């Protein structure tokens, strides 16, 4: 960007909406690339601050959810907490 | 990267796994950032080539899934086809 931003809630409503649309596209594009490069099936669910639902699926959202339900447990499960932790470890 | 790559399947099993781990982290990190910056709840489901499930949730995967079921209709719905089309319009 023109400036480094801190990873912290954006307060200006309009800045938030603009960042949201941009980074959402950027998130989906990364997912697209991963799914092709590495032969992954991906589903992504986003609820924005107003609880609008946005979704992406490499090929089929329904197939992937149905698959998820047939698997008893995830081979890996991460949350924001875990991501923060990895970053701390990764250092600079 | 040191060179541009095409968006195509990686055939070298080792290159694939290495890219897979790097980019998976990258994607989750973007999701983390988005969830905090714009106050959002996010769930990610990934099945790799070997059909091993990896998942991420800003806060709670179960809650996100539970919420999902209460919407009859997604407010926006994209697939690879959609992303491929958007990129076309921009080279």
């Amino acid at each position: 960007g023109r400036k480094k931003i801190q990873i912290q809630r954006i307060t200006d409503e309009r800045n938030r909406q603009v960042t949201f649309t941009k980074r959402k596209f950027g998130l989906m594009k990364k997912a697209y690339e991963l799914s092709v490069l590495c032969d992954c099936e991906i589903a992504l669910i986003i609820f924005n601050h107003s609880n609008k639902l946005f979704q992406y699926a490499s090929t089929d959202m329904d197939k992937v959810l149905l698959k998820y339900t047939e698997y008893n447990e995830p081979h890996e499960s991460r949350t924001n907490a875990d991501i923060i932790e990895t970053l701390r470890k990764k250092g600079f | 990267g040191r060179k541009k790559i095409q968006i195509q399947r990686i055939t070298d099993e080792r290159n694939r796994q290495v890219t897979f781990t790097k980019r998976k982290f990258g994607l989750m990190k973007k999701a983390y950032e988005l969830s905090v910056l714009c106050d959002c709840e996010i769930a990610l489901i990934i099945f790799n080539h070997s059909n091993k499930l990896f998942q991420y949730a800003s806060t709670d995967m179960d809650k996100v899934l539970l919420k999902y079921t209460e919407y009859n209709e997604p407010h926006e719905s994209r697939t690879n086809a959609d992303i491929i089309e958007t990129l076309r319009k921009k080279g």
Partner: peptide, 15 residues
Amino acid sequence: GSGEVKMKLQEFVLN
């Protein structure tokens, strides 16, 4: 209860 969530998700998508 992930098994409940999965079963509710299952029924939703299927219906």
